[PDB]
Structure formats: C-alpha cells, structure tokens
Fold this sequence. Notes:
PDB class: plant protein
CATH class: Mainly Beta
Number of strands: 12
CATH superfamily: Thaumatin
Name: Thaumatin-1
Entry title: T. danielli thaumatin at 100K, Data set 2
Number of domains: 1
Strand content: 35-45%
Assembly: monomeric
Radius of gyration: 16 Å
Keywords: Conformational variation, Radiation damage, plant protein
CATH topology: Thaumatin
Structural class: mainly beta
CATH architecture: Sandwich
Largest sheet: 7 strands, antiparallel
Amino acid sequence: ATFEIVNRCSYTVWAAASKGDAALDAGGRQLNSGESWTINVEPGTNGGKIWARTDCYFDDSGSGICKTGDCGGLLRCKRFGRPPTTLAEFSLNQYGKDYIDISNIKGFNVPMNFSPTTRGCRGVRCAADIVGQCPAKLKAPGGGCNDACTVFQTSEYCCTTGKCGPTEYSRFFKRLCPDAFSYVLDKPTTVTCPGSSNYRVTFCPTA
C-alpha cells in the first residue's frame, strides 16, 4: 500500500513509520512545511503506526533526540515513539479488509487527517488545539499533551486488567476529537476500508 505523508504545518516535523519491531519503508524522514514523503508499506502489515516528531536534532549517523515521539534516538525509526504522539494506526489486508484509526491513547502532539486516497471508505481527523487546551497535569514540558496512562501509570488509565471505563482525562481527548480513540475500551472509531486501499496522512490539515 502507498501512504503519502504531507506536512501542512508551519513547522518542520520528522515523520515516523513503524510496526513496533521494525521500520516501515525508510522508517523516518524530515518533512519541512509543505514537503511530502511517499512510503510503501507491505501488504498485510498489522499494527502499523505513523506519527510526527517535533523539535528534533540528528547527527550525520542519523542519531539524536526528538522532544516528542523520539524512537530510541534514531532518524529512521524501528520502534514506536515516546509519548506524547498523535497516532495514525492501521492493519492492512486483514481478511480482505484494511482497518485504520487515529488514536490519542498515547497522547497528542500534532493535528492529523488520515484519509484513503482510493474509493470505498471515509477518512478520520483529529484537528483540535489539544495542546493549547491540555489539562495542566497532562501538559508535556517538552511539548504536547500526554495521555493519563503515561503520566499516572494506573490500572484504570492503562486498562491493565482489560476492565476500565472512561475518565475525566479520556473525556477531554474525546470532546476535542470524537473521531479518535481516547482510551483503550473506547467505542471504536476504526474505519473499515477496502483491502489494499491507499492513504494520505496530513499533519496540520486545517492550518
């Protein structure tokens, strides 16, 4: 499948693409304001993510740090990123269908539109000023709005027993972005698309 990754933000981001235990395509790349990156993700990829990273520094090796979404210090991500990260999530060619969502389960750093570029389904968006509106106890000094699990490490926010409900902190995310996962048992906002559809991830879709 092809994913086009567009930075419409006024600031540079370093895009990242991983399935947890490896890189998708080149794994990451700098995207300047307006600049785009074309990746190929293997059919059948299950549990893939794409995200933006902010305020990064990388040496000539491709080693360094990011204030949000840092993936073990590497330009070319092999692993998931450090919260806070807004997440484009997907599983492709799962019994004939592709499944996509946006999630705030791991917090929010950048607004995002995750749209199929082929027919048969609809896109999702999380485009609110979540960082501007972020409750004080979830503000990430590095930048961004951490979710509550990251911050408090409770069974309730982390859904460690598989039994949790919504919380004041999850409802904040949900009110700013009803089309994105706010906590693990949230009513699913997943999008069933055709198998082998194609996609565009846009950072800062409105601005």
